[PDB]
């Protein structure tokens, strides 16, 4: 399930709160999404998880 590095600008600045950026191409389009750090969720990992 192949995943690639984001453009520098996205890699550095897209994901917040110590998340990691990953990129997929779907239908020849780059989709930049993120792997959230423990306790965060949201698209840019911006929201704190509630128990």
């Amino acid at each position: 399930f192949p995943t690639y590095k984001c453009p520098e600008t996205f890699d550095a600045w897209y994901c917040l709160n110590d998340a990691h950026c990953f990129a997929v191409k779907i239908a020849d389009l780059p989709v930049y999404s993120c792997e959230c750090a423990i306790g965060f969720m949201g698209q840019r990992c911006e929201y704190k998880e509630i128990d």
């Binding site: 399930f1 600008t9 996205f10 600045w13 897209y14 917040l16 709160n17 990691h20 997929v24 779907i26 239908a27 389009l29 989709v31 930049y32 999404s33 993120c34 792997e35 959230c36 750090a37 423990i38 969720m41 949201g42 698209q43 840019r44 990992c45 911006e46 929201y47 704190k48 509630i50 128990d51």
Partner: protein, 531 residues
Amino acid sequence: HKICIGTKSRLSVPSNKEHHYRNLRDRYTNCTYVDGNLELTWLPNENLDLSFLDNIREVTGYILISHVDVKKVVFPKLQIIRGRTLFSLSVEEEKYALFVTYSKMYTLEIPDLRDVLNGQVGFHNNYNLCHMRTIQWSEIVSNGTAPERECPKCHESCTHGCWGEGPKNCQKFSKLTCSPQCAGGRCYGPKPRECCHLFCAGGCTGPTQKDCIACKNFFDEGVCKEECPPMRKYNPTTYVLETNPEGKYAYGATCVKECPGHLLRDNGACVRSCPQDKMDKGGECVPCNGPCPKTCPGVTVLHAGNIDSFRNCTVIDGNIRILDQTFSGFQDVYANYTMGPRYIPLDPERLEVFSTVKEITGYLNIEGTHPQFRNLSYFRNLETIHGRQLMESMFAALAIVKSSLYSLEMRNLKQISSGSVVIQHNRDLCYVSNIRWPAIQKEPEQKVWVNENLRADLCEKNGTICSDQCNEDGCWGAGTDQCLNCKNFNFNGTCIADCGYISNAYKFDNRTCKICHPECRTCNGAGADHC
């Protein structure tokens, strides 16, 4: 008939996928009707149970299925997808009510699915998936292959295509199937004049409005209506609006006789907020005589970029969320997913802007962490949180989660109109467990969660425990003003043991002292000569 709230994180996931699975199971099991988008992503291991899907009947937003490798995905009871929120890959391009991609299931069985009300259907780059090419999506969508593995014929049983192997699995038709006299609707037999009322959604069992499966717009009295019974009903014969004794307020897909009361009433509707022509009056969304009080829209996250807007606001329409990134500062992203402008870190001293604030129509959410973000005295003049819009599945009007706060300090907060209090995992926060929140909340049905804050004993030893001058109701901080309710006497919003302590105080009530008229030093009473 349980509700559940859909997520909206798209292809993003928790690092821990087992956690992720358990997150979905929690959210969706026993769910009938999902409000929002249901995103079923990153089940990378076959043999995950997937039972939570079993009860879902309606999804208001889009359904997105991505990176799921369970062999067979079944939505046993899903019949309609409203697609009121749609999924996109770039701002230009199709918006999807259903999109499955990069996924390893052998079959996606959504039998019994009748209607996708808005948005398109998409499948991209997912092998082993079958029978989707055999499905007529023209039948399911209003307007808008090469699987490499075998691919079992549909059962002999059924005339068109199928969702999967069963005779249970062939696609049925309620729409394309019936007479042309039914344009705009589904239809319950194939004869012309066997069609269902244009008011409902996803089929119907007969011609009348009591008869469809779901209500397209409003459900009232067990009958679908397109519009709630009007307060003023028009008469076409004599050209006049009459007053309607049968009139009812529109309250999100139901018609109610009186509004919830934490809501406003626009002409025919229970509303969250007045539109630009009009303004709040007691209850009603009345029009502005002359000027319209300028107002302050809530912000999605509070940051150094938007803080200025809140200067001099008495009422915040919307909500206030101060999150970690508020203090740390962050880059913004435009809706194109091009990087926008960077935001300098916010300094808690700048939150003073809210001191003018008296009411919050949405919810207050404080999760931000910072060495100097100690109290919440910026909101010292805030007196009510309306809770017209709540936060998370907890349904919180006031959520304080993992903030750096030590005390609340919100002296004037008298009311939370609707929704719950949730205050958890604030490590040196005090007072919060001794605050009798019910006092503050408008209705006893409203709930409170207070857990994992600085332990009560540990506050006591520090002596951050609240005046003697206040009752069992608790308090927002240590000081005499802080107390929610004075124990004995109240003088100038200060809690005092006995009026006599202050010479300039005279005993106005049984629970009050007022200051003595400039004129004289010590009064018996409340006068210019009286003293």
